[PDB]
Design an enzyme around this catalytic site. Structure first.
Site, PDB file in Angstrom:
ATOM      1  N   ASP A  39       7.872 -15.481  -5.085  1.00  0.00           N
ATOM      2  CA  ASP A  39       7.522 -14.125  -5.618  1.00  0.00           C
ATOM      3  C   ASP A  39       7.948 -13.686  -7.273  1.00  0.00           C
ATOM      4  O   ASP A  39       7.621 -14.567  -7.872  1.00  0.00           O
ATOM      5  CB  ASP A  39       8.655 -13.050  -4.689  1.00  0.00           C
ATOM      6  CG  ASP A  39       7.759 -12.231  -3.939  1.00  0.00           C
ATOM      7  OD1 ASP A  39       8.291 -11.859  -2.661  1.00  0.00           O
ATOM      8  OD2 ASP A  39       6.419 -12.137  -4.020  1.00  0.00           O
ATOM      9  N   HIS A  69      10.392  -6.700  -6.256  1.00  0.00           N
ATOM     10  CA  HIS A  69       9.654  -7.340  -5.318  1.00  0.00           C
ATOM     11  C   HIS A  69       9.969  -8.785  -4.726  1.00  0.00           C
ATOM     12  O   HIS A  69       9.639  -9.171  -3.718  1.00  0.00           O
ATOM     13  CB  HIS A  69       8.113  -7.182  -5.420  1.00  0.00           C
ATOM     14  CG  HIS A  69       7.068  -7.290  -4.279  1.00  0.00           C
ATOM     15  ND1 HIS A  69       7.647  -7.779  -2.946  1.00  0.00           N
ATOM     16  CD2 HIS A  69       5.625  -7.409  -4.189  1.00  0.00           C
ATOM     17  CE1 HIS A  69       6.522  -8.219  -2.131  1.00  0.00           C
ATOM     18  NE2 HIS A  69       5.340  -7.635  -3.006  1.00  0.00           N
ATOM     19  N   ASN A 161      -2.932  -6.294   1.679  1.00  0.00           N
ATOM     20  CA  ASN A 161      -2.690  -4.704   1.862  1.00  0.00           C
ATOM     21  C   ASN A 161      -4.031  -4.149   1.750  1.00  0.00           C
ATOM     22  O   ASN A 161      -3.818  -2.788   1.254  1.00  0.00           O
ATOM     23  CB  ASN A 161      -1.494  -4.378   0.990  1.00  0.00           C
ATOM     24  CG  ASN A 161      -0.220  -5.091   1.478  1.00  0.00           C
ATOM     25  OD1 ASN A 161      -0.025  -5.084   2.504  1.00  0.00           O
ATOM     26  ND2 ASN A 161       0.737  -5.191   0.179  1.00  0.00           N
ATOM     27  N   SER A 224       3.569  -7.942   2.495  1.00  0.00           N
ATOM     28  CA  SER A 224       4.525  -9.016   1.752  1.00  0.00           C
ATOM     29  C   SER A 224       6.009  -8.362   2.202  1.00  0.00           C
ATOM     30  O   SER A 224       7.068  -9.099   1.631  1.00  0.00           O
ATOM     31  CB  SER A 224       4.216  -8.955   0.106  1.00  0.00           C
ATOM     32  OG  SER A 224       4.326  -7.449  -0.299  1.00  0.00           O
TER      33      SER A 224
END
Length: 279
Positions: A39, A69, A161, A224
Site C-alpha cells: 500500500d 491508507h 470501487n 481495499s
C-alpha cells in the site's frame, strides 16, 4: 477469544448474522504468519501494531506512510484492535506514493519483491499479501499477481470501487488470486463494490474503522478495506493450519457465509468471509 466492541466488520467475519459487536477468534490470532501489506506504507510505530508492523521496502524517497491508507489496511489485517490476525507479522511494501497513485511498473516490482523477500523471513504458518490497490486492466499486473500467487503467497486483491465488472481492472481480474468484494454493515453489497464472475469472496468494506497515521484511527470505505479483512483471515486460518497459502482463497470461499448478501448481481458469488470460529 472474544473482542468486545469490535468493529462491525471484525465481528461480521466471525458471525453468521450482521449487527453484532463481538469478534470471536481463535487464541492463535495468526501468529507465525506474514501479511505483506502492499500500500502507501505502514506507520510501523503505531501503538496498535505492538511491534509487529515492519517496513521492508519502499519505492519512493521515504518508507514513511504519509497517507494512512497503508497503515489503515495493515491495521485491518493484524492490528490489536482492528485486525483479523491480531498476532500476525506485517511487512510494508510501499508501492504507492503519499497520495494513492503509483505506476503499474512499481506495483509489479513490489509484488515481485514480496515473492523473493519471503524467502528470508520467519513465516512458518505461511505468507500472505494484501493488495489494497487496483488500477485498470493490465495483463502485466495480472501476471505479476499470478506469479506472486504461484510463488507461495496468498494474494488478496480488491475488486475495485467503481461498481462494475471487476474483470476490467488489475490485479482484480487475475483468476488465481482472491479478488475481494466489499460488504456493508447491513449485509448489503457496498454501493461501490465491484461485482463479476471472477470475484471470489466479499468482505466488510464500508465504514471500516482501523488504524491511521499520526497514531490515530479512521473509518474509511472500499474494497481495499474489504481486502485486508480477508488477508488476515487467510493468515488466521493458515496459522490455524486450516488451509494452505496457495489454496487459502478457496477455503474462505468454501467456508464462507452463502446467500446472505443483498444486491449481488446475477453471476457474482454471494459469499461473505466467515472464520467459522466455533467457541
Amino acid at each position: 477469544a472474544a473482542q468486545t466492541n469490535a468493529p462491525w466488520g471484525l465481528a461480521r467475519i466471525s458471525s453468521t448474522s450482521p449487527g453484532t459487536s463481538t469478534y470471536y477468534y481463535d487464541e492463535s490470532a495468526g501468529q507465525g504468519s506474514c501479511v505483506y501489506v502492499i500500500d502507501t506504507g505502514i506507520e510501523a510505530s503505531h501503538p496498535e501494531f505492538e511491534g509487529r508492523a515492519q517496513m521492508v521496502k519502499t519505492y519512493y524517497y521515504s518508507s514513511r506512510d504519509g497517507n494512512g491508507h497503508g497503515t489503515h489496511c495493515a491495521g485491518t489485517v493484524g492490528s490489536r484492535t482492528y485486525g483479523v490476525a491480531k498476532k500476525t507479522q506485517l511487512f510494508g511494501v510501499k508501492v504507492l506514493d503519499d497520495n494513492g497513485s503509483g505506476q503499474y511498473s512499481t506495483i509489479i516490482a513490489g509484488m515481485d519483491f514480496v515473492a523473493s523477500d519471503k524467502n528470508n523471513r520467519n513465516c512458518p504458518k505461511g505468507v500472505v499479501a494484501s493488495l489494497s490497490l487496483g488500477g485498470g486492466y493490465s495483463s502485466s499486473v495480472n501476471s505479476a499477481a499470478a506469479r506472486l500467487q504461484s510463488s507461495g503467497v496468498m494474494v488478496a486483491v480488491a475488486a475495485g470501487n467503481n461498481n462494475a465488472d471487476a474483470r476490467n481492472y488489475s490485479p482484480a481480474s487475475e483468476p488465481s488470486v482472491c479478488t475481494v468484494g466489499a460488504s456493508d454493515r447491513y449485509d448489503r453489497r457496498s454501493s461501490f463494490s465491484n461485482y463479476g464472475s471472477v470475484l471470489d469472496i466479499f468482505g466488510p468494506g464500508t465504514s471500516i474503522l482501523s488504524t491511521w497515521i499520526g497514531g490515530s484511527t479512521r473509518s474509511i470505505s472500499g474494497t481495499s478495506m474489504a481486502t485486508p479483512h480477508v488477508a488476515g483471515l487467510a493468515a488466521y486460518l493458515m496459522t490455524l493450519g486450516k488451509t494452505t497459502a496457495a489454496s487459502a482463497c478457496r477455503y474462505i470461499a468454501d467456508t464462507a457465509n452463502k446467500g446472505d448478501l443483498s444486491n449481488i448481481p446475477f453471476g457474482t458469488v454471494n459469499l461473505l468471509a466467515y472464520n467459522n470460529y466455533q467457541a
